[PDB]
Amino acid sequence: SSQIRQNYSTEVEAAVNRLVNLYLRASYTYLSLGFYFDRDDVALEGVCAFFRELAEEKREGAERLLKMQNQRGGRALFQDLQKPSQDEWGTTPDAMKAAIVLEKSLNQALLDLHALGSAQADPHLCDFLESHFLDEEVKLIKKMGDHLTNIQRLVGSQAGLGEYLFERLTLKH
């Protein structure tokens, strides 16, 4: 039961639960991406760290959604988390491309939920999504696009050398 729920539709409640699943799926995907780059036959630690950081960011996003669900008086419902789409992630550009596709899918899910919020006249939801999610997605996708452009520029010259240089000079910290 709840004694606090106000202006919070069942449609939004369900969409928030689905979004939590998407964010946790994304986190899982990034966990797989990170460890792939830590394989001794891949060995690009800056790339491992980049994706591991994203895994943490996506988990944090799911937790923020869940906190908000409870703040509004909605009820968390969890579903199975599907395994990531690949077991091996190819080259650095392959991985960065996959990451952009993933982020665009999350961004579209956020946009869809914001639209539902608007249709349901739920300004708390719509603002929650922008502050913690929509601006972060735009910034993140720009960073990934910039990364992809740099790695593409590098591997068009020399693939092995380019991947090493990108990891050493852009990613490693």
41 binds, among Pd ion, its own copies, none (CB under 5 to 8 A by kind): its own copies
| Cα–Cα distance for residue pair 63/166, rounded to 1 Å | 32
106 within 8 A of 20, measured Cβ to Cβ: no
145 within 8 A of 100, measured Cβ to Cβ: yes
32 binds, among Pd ion, its own copies, none (CB under 5 to 8 A by kind): its own copies
Which residue's CB is nearer to its own copies, number 11 or number 77?
A: 77
Which residue's CB is nearer to Pd ion, number 123 or number 156?
A: 123
53 is in an annotated binding site: yes
167 is in an annotated binding site: no
56 is in an annotated binding site: yes
Q: How far is the CB of 147 from its own copies (least distance, A)?
A: 8
**What number of CA atoms fall less than 13 Å from residue 143's CA on the CB side?**
13
| Cα–Cα distance for residue pair 52/34, rounded to 1 Å | 5
Closest by CA position to 148, among listed 84, 104, 82, 85:
104
133 within 8 A of 85, measured Cβ to Cβ: no
11 is in an annotated binding site: no
63 within 8 A of 115, measured Cβ to Cβ: no
19 within 8 A of 110, measured Cβ to Cβ: yes
63 is in an annotated binding site: yes
Residue 126 engages Pd ion in binding (rule: CB under 5 A) = yes
Which residue's CB is nearer to Pd ion, number 117 or number 162?
A: 117
Each residue 75-114 as x (binds Pd ion by CB under 5 A) or -, in order, gives: ----------------------------------------
Tokens 């699943």 -> residue: 21
Q: How far is the CB of 111 from Pd ion (least distance, A)?
A: 12
Number of residues that bind Pd ion (CB under 5 A): 2
Binding-site residues for Fe cation, in ranges, read: 53, 56-57, 60, 63
| Binding interface with Pd ion (CB under 5 A) | 123, 126
